[PDB]
Amino acid sequence: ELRVGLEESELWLRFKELTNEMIVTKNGRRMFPVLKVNVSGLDPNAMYSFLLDFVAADNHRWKYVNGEWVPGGKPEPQAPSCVYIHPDSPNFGAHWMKAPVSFSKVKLTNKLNGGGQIMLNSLHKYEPRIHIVRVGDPQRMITSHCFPETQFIAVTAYQNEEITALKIKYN
Ligand SMILES: O=C(O)COCc1ccccc1
């Protein structure tokens, strides 16, 4: 059976209970925590690519008021559907299963200034999603995998001082 497990789920949950935030910048910022998954039940003999995108979580934007996140407006038009290709792609099932798959180099931006960066809208909530794409497949069989534990609001600066502190503690 194909199984994709979130690594460091307890760490992600510490951020999620505060409401997680990720900085977006013109030139793009790496994530903390980093999304990492374990994988079993691929065909070790087959080749696959791992793609990461970010799904808009809500039909409204958010704002941090009196130390609480609350609905903050109607959403902006959706960011373009940017996909990050895991740099080990394409690779054998055996490669993906031998150790956890880390998306440590993906950068989140608020400027379409290129460079395999992911464009997000500030004060919108996103859910990371991984796709496993089988290589050489005339059916183009693909799996999708959502990580609710890893939901965050994109921000140009941290709103919650507890997030700023957690980011320093664990990073
Ligand atoms: O989904 C399965 O039963 C086989 O998993 C390997 C896989 C096949 C195609 C695309 C992604 C993963």
Distance (angstroms) between ligand 1 centre and the Cα of 36 equals: 19
Most ligand 1 atoms within 8 A of CB, residue of 1, 2, 37 to mutate: 2
CB half-sphere exposure, 165, CA atoms < 13 A = 5
Centroid of ligand 1 to alpha carbon of 44 (angstroms): 11
Cis peptide before 90 (omega within 30 of 0): yes
| Beta-ladder partners of 52 | 84, 130
Superfamily name with CATH number, domain 1-171: Transcription factor, T-box (2.60.40.820)
The torsion of the CA quartet 101, 81, 60, 123, rounded to 10 degrees, works out to 60
CA of 92 from ligand 1 middle (Å) equals 12
Closest CA to 48 of 131, 147, 116, 104: 131
Which method was used?
A: X-ray
Ligand 1 neighbours (beta carbon < 6 A): 2, 41-43, 48, 132, 134, 141-143
